Amino acid sequence: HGSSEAFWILVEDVDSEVILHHEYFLLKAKYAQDEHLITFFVPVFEPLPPQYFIRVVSDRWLSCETQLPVSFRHLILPEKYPPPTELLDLQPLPVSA
Amino acid sequence: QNTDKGNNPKGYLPSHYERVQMLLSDRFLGFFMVPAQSSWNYNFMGVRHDPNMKYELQLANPKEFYHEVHRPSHFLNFALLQEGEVYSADREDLYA
Amino acid sequence: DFKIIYIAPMRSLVQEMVGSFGKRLATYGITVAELTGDHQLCKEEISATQIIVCTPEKWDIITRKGGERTYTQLVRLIILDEIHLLHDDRGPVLEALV
Amino acid sequence: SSEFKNITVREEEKLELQKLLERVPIPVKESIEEPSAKINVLLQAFISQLKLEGFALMADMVYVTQSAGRLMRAIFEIVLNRGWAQLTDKTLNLCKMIDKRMWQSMCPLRQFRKLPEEVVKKIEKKNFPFERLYDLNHNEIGELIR
Amino acid sequence: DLHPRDIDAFWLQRQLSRFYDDAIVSQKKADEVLEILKTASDDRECENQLVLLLGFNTFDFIKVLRQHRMMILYCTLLASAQSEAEKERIMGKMEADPELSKFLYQLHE
Incomplete structure (x- = not known):
């Protein structure tokens, strides 16, 4: 293997x-x-996939690959968060307010 | 009850099937299950395939039909390099 | 605190210069080695050794990929063996290096 | 590749190239008197460890494989950077197949060069998956390979 | 984009009715907005009175009320002038100001 794999x-x-x-x-x-x-951090898109796959392969060795299915069956995504409150274009507040 | 494995067996009528509605989807995604120990295509490994064979499954994506692991007699029946590279070319791999 | 690059044109000249400088600088404990292998092996061999004997192309592909950037303040001497390789088709490698 | 822009297929080796083209395992879409088919079957005849005979053909094979290390790594990095997963599996595998000089359906125990090749071909003859060898004992391995 | 001809006597209540489903409270909010637009020292305290009365919601209408503060007010006062002497009084007040005289020209042709 050497100093590193x-x-x-x-x-x-x-x-x-x-x-x-x-x-x-x-x-x-x-x-x-x-x-x-x-x-x-991996992105997840709107047709929610059943899995992602993590393949950790060797950069040097043939047939050295571990695949792991990150399964999204029981994945409860968070709700699509409410939109932020807008800057209502208030006339800018003088300190006498 | 049928045993005639030909293309026109006896007693075969078009009332034996009915076309059902099938449609496509961008809205959801399916997945695949391949065998765990081996892969799915035994068309080149035809003697290794038994009808009473047993297999576990694996949440993976399937390889192509003509993938490397599906035709191992095309990649594995090579004679080994026995007294090869003895009258080869001298070329130094300068970059590697 | 220092590294010396010995840039020799052919690879078997490099593999025998490794033996020659490993015999001559043995009393100093100086590690002489040849830059070969993948880029991680080459940056490990640069980090481990003092006389780095290499081809112009191997040292240039290390400087392009960047695996000597942590040890170029430690490179204080490059020795371009057979610099009339400037005339060769391998000339642009030595001109880029220098 | 433009590294092989001067590789031409000479007629004095074409017969030998046909004996490679019927034996290389990845099919070649080109005809053998086009140079790209020559570079194709020379890379595949390298990885297959086919014994070549022409001096020009062995020299072209040594050249295309010593270029093929960096060329396949550059294809792998282009394909990996653009994010194509099937082609990056294929290209990283082909980098390791050019480097290790074996096809990936061969036994992974050929990457340890210290084994006898007769026991490795006995493992490839008794074709079980390689991951079966992990669960066995050192007795159980040795009697599975006989 | 808001024209003096677009503002009639109940344009204000019709715009408040997009936020108030009842009509008594939309009429109340309309005449409260009229006295905010009328009894105002200047711009920002009037616009703060409008966001105090109508909320941080309805703010695009408060933006329209603030941008055309004299047009909306004097065209609503002119269009809701029930007497005729009240109408020529409001028009005489509008001819004394060139912004209101501009709105008065835009009302006719």
Whole structure:
């Protein structure tokens, strides 16, 4: 393996034809045998997909791929938030108010 | 009750089926389930396919028909490089 | 606190200059190595070694990808072996490097 | 690629190229007297480890594969940056197939070059999935491969 | 875009009725808006009286009331002039101001 093993974290839709989030992941030799928290943010579109897929593939090794289906079956999305209060174009307030 | 696997078996009428309404959708998305241990296409691995075979499933997307893992005899039956690269070309990979 | 780049034109000249400078600078503890492999292996080999023996193209692809940027304030000496490679079709690599 | 703009297919090797074109596993849409079909089957004859015979053809193969490392990595980075997931799976796999010099349906134990190739071809002969080998013991592996 | 011919005697109440479904309260809000537009020192305290009376809602109408404060007021006073002497009195008051004389010209032709 050497000093490091390089991986690609590819997060893609149900069709696996758009990468919603790719990122490089260096698994360094000091930090094998322990969990790496990789926090990222993926977009979710209005035809709510059944899954995303996280493929963590090796950058160097053939047939080194772990796919994980992030399933959206029991995913309760938050409500589409109310619109912000508008700046009503008030005539600007003198301090005598 | 049918056993005649031909294209015109006996007792086969067009009252055996009725066309039902089927329509398409942009409004929702479906998904796929592929087998877990192997993949789905056994048209090249035809002897490896039994009708009484057992398979688990996998929430994945299916590979193409002519994908690499579906025709392993096209990629795996190669003779190994035995006394190859001995009269090859000297070219230095300068960038790699 | 320092790195020395030895840019030699051919790769087997580089692989024997690694042995020559590894024998001659052995009493100093100086790590001589050859820039090969993927870009992560090359930035690890730059971070680990002092005499970095490479082709002009390998050092140029490292400077283009940026894997020496943390150690160019540590590069104090580049040695362009066979600089009449400026006449070669590999000439633009050396002209870009210099 | 424009790195292979001077690769021409000479007639003195065309017969050998046909013996590659009937054996390379990815089909080639071109005819073999077009140079792109030559670069195609030379890359696929490299990854397949087919033994070539013409000196010009082995030299063209060594050239197109030493360019193919960077060229396939550049295709992979273009395709990854634009976000195409199927093509980035194909291109990253083809980078690793050019680098490791094996097709991805072959055993992953060919990337460890320290194994005997006879036991690796015994593993590929007994074609189970590679992930089956994880659950077995060192006795159970050795008697599954015999 | 608001013309003096567009403002009639009950244009104000017709515009308040888009926010008040009742008609007694729309009539009350209309004559309250009329005395806000009339008994006003100047612009911003009148517009603050309008957002005090009609809320932070109805603000596009308060914008229209503030932008045309003299046109809406004097054309509503002229169109709701029930006497004829009251009508020529309001028109004589409007001829003394060139902005109101401009609205008076726009009312006729």
